[PDB]
From a paper:
[name] [name] (kpRstA) contains an N-terminal receiver domain (RD, residues 1–119) and a C-terminal DNA-binding domain (DBD, residues 131–236), with an overall sequence identity of 79% compared to [name] from E. coli and S. enterica serovar Typhimurium. As a member of the OmpR/PhoB subfamily, phosphorylation of the conserved Asp in the RD is believed to result in dimerization of the domain through a conserved α4–β5–α5 region, accompanied by the binding of the DBD to cognate sequences in the promoter region of [name]-regulated genes.
The two DBDs bind on the same side of the DNA in a head-to-tail fashion and the electrostatic potential surface of the protein dimer forms a long and continuous positively charged region for DNA binding. The α3 recognition helix is docked into the major groove of the DNA and forms numerous interactions with the [name] box. The C-terminal β-hairpin also makes contact with the DNA, mostly close to the phosphate backbone. Unlike the bent DNA conformation observed for the PhoB DBD/DNA complex, the DNA-23 in kpRstA DBD/DNA-23 complex only displayed slight bending (∼10°). The two DNA-bound DBDs interact with each other with a buried surface area of 362 Å2 per monomer at the protein–protein interface. The interface mostly consists of β4 and β5 of the upstream DBD (bound to the 5′ half-site of the coding strand) on one end and the two loops between β2–β3 and β3–α1 of the downstream DBD (bound to the 3′ half-site of the coding strand) on the other end. The two kpRstA DBDs within an asymmetric unit bind to the DNA with similar contacts, with contact surfaces of 882 Å2 between DNA and protein and 899 Å2 for the upstream and downstream protomers, respectively. Specific interactions between the α3 recognition helix residues and DNA, which include Val203-T6, Arg207-G5, Arg199-G17′ and Arg199-T16′, provide the basis for sequence specificity. Noticeably, the α3–β4 loop swings ∼90° towards the template strand of the DNA in the complex, which results in Ala216 interacting with the ribose part of G17′.
Author numbering:
A (entry chain B): 135 to 235
B (entry chain A): 134 to 235
Write the structure that this text describes.
DNA sequence: GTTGTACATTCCGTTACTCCCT
DNA sequence: CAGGGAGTAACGGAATGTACAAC
C-alpha cells in the first residue's frame, strides 16, 4: 500500500526494507533514511542543507562532507557507479538527485 | 475462541501468553513476552526506548540503559531472526526498535 | 531460567587525501 | 598554474549486539 517502487527497486517504509530486482539489499538506518528522502523527492535536486535538516537535523555550515560520504556509502550498496550514476546523480553546486528514469 | 494477533507463521496468544512460530511454542519469560507484545501491537511503528522501558520495567529511559537491547536480542534469538539481517525486528539508530509485519 | 554487565561489534561523522572542473 | 567542489578510505567515538557471569 505505502510501498513506493521504481523500475526494479522497491522501498518499503512499513518494514524498512528495500529490494533491487528480486534481491534484497541490506541497508543501514542512514542508508535507508537517506534513500527514502531522495526517492520522496524523485527527480528533485535535494540540496545539502535540506538533507541535513530532514535527516539529523543540523545546520549546513558551508563546510560539511557527511552528506557526500553518506551518498557514496549509499551509491556502493545500491550498485551504482559514481563515475556515471544511473540512480543517484550529483549536480555541481546544487546537491544530489534521485533518478526515476 | 482465543483472540490473538498474527503475522504469517508467527502467532501471539495473549490469553495464556504463549507465542508460536509455525509451528511450535516459543518460550519467553514474562518480561519478554510483555516487550514482544508491546512491539507487535504497534507493528510497522517505531517504538523508542522510553516507550519500551515504560512497559518492560515501567521506568523512564535514563541511560545508557541497555535492558531493552539484550531483551531485543533474546526475541531475535527466540524468533529465529538474524541481527545483521533482521526480518521481523528492525533496529533504527537513535530511535528505537520496530516490529516488521512482513 | 531470568537478567544485564562487560566486553564484542558495527555505524557514520570527521578527516584527509585524491582527481576533477572552472 | 591557482581554487574549490566532489569521491571515498580510513580513523575512532559512540550506538548497538550478546556470551556468560551473577542471581
Amino acid at each position: 500500500h505505502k510501498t513506493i517502487s521504481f523500475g526494479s527497486l522497491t522501498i518499503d517504509p512499513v518494514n524498512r526494507q528495500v529490494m533491487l530486482g528480486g534481491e534484497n539489499v541490506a541497508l543501514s538506518t542512514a542508508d535507508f533514511d537517506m534513500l527514502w528522502e531522495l526517492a520522496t523527492h524523485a527527480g528533485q535536486i535535494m540540496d545539502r542543507d535540506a538533507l541535513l535538516k530532514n535527516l539529523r537535523g543540523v545546520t549546513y555550515d558551508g563546510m560539511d562532507r557527511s552528506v557526500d560520504v553518506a551518498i557514496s556509502r549509499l551509491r556502493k550498496k545500491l550498485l551504482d557507479n559514481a563515475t556515471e550514476p544511473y540512480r543517484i546523480k550529483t549536480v555541481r553546486n546544487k546537491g544530489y538527485l534521485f533518478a526515476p528514469h
